[PDB]
């Protein structure tokens, strides 16, 4: 039986999600909104582009700054190795 | 032409938003009977899935291939507070039957916004726009360089040699190689 | 805040549907708003990250400074290395039944950690 | 009257300690040990080109223990969906009297290389591992060949399936294979 494969896959998925969350804060890499190019509305659409961070920025940071320690504890508990395979000094 | 495609996209986005809102309402109603063991992660994921899909569709249909906003004028069909039995199934969410004394505090689409005036008054109290813009541009350039570097950087020892094993198995019985 | 969040979501959905229906029926100075918005977003992100760091590296630094009462990573491995090995029926690892040389009758071990509000309290795993 | 089974294999040189550590805690109670053997493979043929199994490889450890040979040859048919199996036997002998009678009966030797190693008590079975040593006449494979030896009467031979379960344990760099 190979159950460690599922654990390794879960750990890799958690690491990939953490990396993507750490990389998901660069959506403004193309511009800094130096001008008001909002042709529809500049009061509620263009100005609120950053005022809606709760649904845009703070909506990904919450889960993105929570998976790290959770995945660490999950890996340390689900796999609490204790497998020296010889019990070196224990027999001693 | 483009107007028909935009109208079809808006209708599809409205249908998808209504479906997502119904799903979120069903999930919230399921979060009331099973009020116990309500982890914060599930609620956060539900709030993210209910906001993102709608916000992205709303922003895509407003800042992508849109004509000049000076020619098109906003004009509704009619303003009639008549109770019709064949028109209450065509608004999908509100304005089923209009009231009489509802003009004052219902006509501004039920205005939730109350912090815009406060933010404007706070910004007006600070009445230099050259160093800040330059710093913002520099930070944006640095973030872009970091993202490009990350994207550029993002993109089994064997111990069971079959040959040696077969050779040892042969030497175990056959004399070729053994002696 | 189940009912409060439900009512907030309902109001938001009602506003969104009203705006969508209205759009469908209609279809047929030293301000520096961007700078202030970016500053507010940076402040919010910094506050969120500081809250996360306080939740992670300040409430879990008990055993990092001085070894105190904590079943997490301080008690289970002790009894493990001292008495038995790891095994998973559900969470049953190395029951003491002399199965090594007994050959008389088998017995399992229902050993599982538990929580309790006290000072210097271990897991206290459960003939008897 | 009896038969033996085998699921022998091999493994790399550096990868033994990590291996034998696991192999110890598989079916053995405790106190792992080892043994230094001595190969006295003989040859009894000259009429049908089919000699006997005269590989009298016996330990060169503390005296008292008697040297002897075992029967292992002529793999019989059968073993439906099973591993190696051969109807065999065993035969103990007096100290050096076996070699004496073999030489008096007109026999010769077959090999002069000794392969010490480790043993491990399984349940109804047993497992061994060894490595050939390069020595001269008065003194090679550089690979520790391992094997799963088990001998038993006819019976039902169902335990072979249990032997396959041990194959599950020997997952990382061990497998089973026949010889031809």
Curated annotation (Swiss-Prot), chain A:
GO terms for cellular component: core mediator complex; mediator complex; nucleoplasm; nucleus. Keywords: Activator, Coiled coil, Nucleus, Transcription, Transcription regulation. It comes from the Eukaryota. It is found in: Nucleus. GO terms for molecular function: transcription coregulator activity. Component of the Mediator complex, which is composed of MED1, MED4, MED6, MED7, MED8, MED9, MED10, MED11, MED12, MED13, MED13L, MED14, MED15, MED16, MED17, MED18, MED19, MED20, MED21, MED22, MED23, MED24, MED25, MED26, MED27, MED29, MED30, MED31, CCNC, CDK8 and CDC2L6/CDK11. The MED12, MED13, CCNC and CDK8 subunits form a distinct module termed the CDK8 module. Mediator containing the CDK8 module is less active than Mediator lacking this module in supporting transcriptional activation. Component of the Mediator complex, a coactivator involved in the regulated transcription of nearly all RNA polymerase II-dependent genes. Mediator functions as a bridge to convey information from gene-specific regulatory proteins to the basal RNA polymerase II transcription machinery. Mediator is recruited to promoters by direct interactions with regulatory proteins and serves as a scaffold for the assembly of a functional preinitiation complex with RNA polymerase II and the general transcription factors. This is Mediator of RNA polymerase II transcription subunit 22. It comes from Mus musculus.
Curated annotation (Swiss-Prot), chain B:
Residues 138-147 are annotated as: Interaction with the Elongin BC complex. It is found in: Nucleus. GO terms for cellular component: core mediator complex; mediator complex; nucleoplasm; nucleus. Transmembrane segments: none annotated. GO terms for molecular function: transcription coregulator activity. Residues 1-27, 129-155 form a coiled coil. The modification Phosphoserine is found at residue 80. Its main location: nucleus. It comes from the Eukaryota. Keywords: Activator, Coiled coil, Nucleus, Phosphoprotein, Transcription, Transcription regulation, Ubl conjugation pathway. One of its GO terms (biological process) is RNA polymerase II preinitiation complex assembly. Belongs to the Mediator complex subunit 8 family. Component of the Mediator complex, which is composed of MED1, MED4, MED6, MED7, MED8, MED9, MED10, MED11, MED12, MED13, MED13L, MED14, MED15, MED16, MED17, MED18, MED19, MED20, MED21, MED22, MED23, MED24, MED25, MED26, MED27, MED29, MED30, MED31, CCNC, CDK8 and CDC2L6/CDK11. The MED12, MED13, CCNC and CDK8 subunits form a distinct module termed the CDK8 module. Mediator containing the CDK8 module is less active than Mediator lacking this module in supporting transcriptional activation. This is Mediator of RNA polymerase II transcription subunit 8. It comes from Mus musculus (Mouse). The gene is Med8. The chain holds residues 3 to 192 of 268 of the full protein.
UniProtKB/Swiss-Prot annotation, chain C:
It comes from the Eukaryota. It is found in: Nucleus. Signal peptide: none annotated. Component of the Mediator complex, which is composed of MED1, MED4, MED6, MED7, MED8, MED9, MED10, MED11, MED12, MED13, MED13L, MED14, MED15, MED16, MED17, MED18, MED19, MED20, MED21, MED22, MED23, MED24, MED25, MED26, MED27, MED29, MED30, MED31, CCNC, CDK8 and CDC2L6/CDK11. The MED12, MED13, CCNC and CDK8 subunits form a distinct module termed the CDK8 module. Mediator containing the CDK8 module is less active than Mediator lacking this module in supporting transcriptional activation. Component of the Mediator complex, a coactivator involved in the regulated transcription of nearly all RNA polymerase II-dependent genes. Mediator functions as a bridge to convey information from gene-specific regulatory proteins to the basal RNA polymerase II transcription machinery. Mediator is recruited to promoters by direct interactions with regulatory proteins and serves as a scaffold for the assembly of a functional preinitiation complex with RNA polymerase II and the general transcription factors. Belongs to the Mediator complex subunit 17 family. This is Mediator of RNA polymerase II transcription subunit 17. It comes from Mus musculus. The chain holds residues 91 to 250 of 649 of the full protein.
Swiss-Prot record, chain D:
Keywords: Activator, Nucleus, Phosphoprotein, Transcription, Transcription regulation. Gene3D superfamilies: Hypothetical Protein Pfu-838710-001. GO terms for molecular function: transcription coregulator activity. One of its GO terms (cellular component) is nucleus. It is found in: Nucleus. Transmembrane segments: none annotated. InterPro entries: Mediator_Med18. GO terms for biological process: positive regulation of transcription elongation by RNA polymerase II; positive regulation of transcription initiation by RNA polymerase II; RNA polymerase II preinitiation complex assembly. The modification Phosphoserine is found at residue 50. Belongs to the Mediator complex subunit 18 family. Component of the Mediator complex, which is composed of MED1, MED4, MED6, MED7, MED8, MED9, MED10, MED11, MED12, MED13, MED13L, MED14, MED15, MED16, MED17, MED18, MED19, MED20, MED21, MED22, MED23, MED24, MED25, MED26, MED27, MED29, MED30, MED31, CCNC, CDK8 and CDC2L6/CDK11. The MED12, MED13, CCNC and CDK8 subunits form a distinct module termed the CDK8 module. Mediator containing the CDK8 module is less active than Mediator lacking this module in supporting transcriptional activation. PANTHER family: MEDIATOR OF RNA POLYMERASE II TRANSCRIPTION SUBUNIT 18, MEDIATOR OF RNA POLYMERASE II TRANSCRIPTION, SUBUNIT 18. This is Mediator of RNA polymerase II transcription subunit 18. It comes from Mus musculus (Mouse). The gene is Med18.
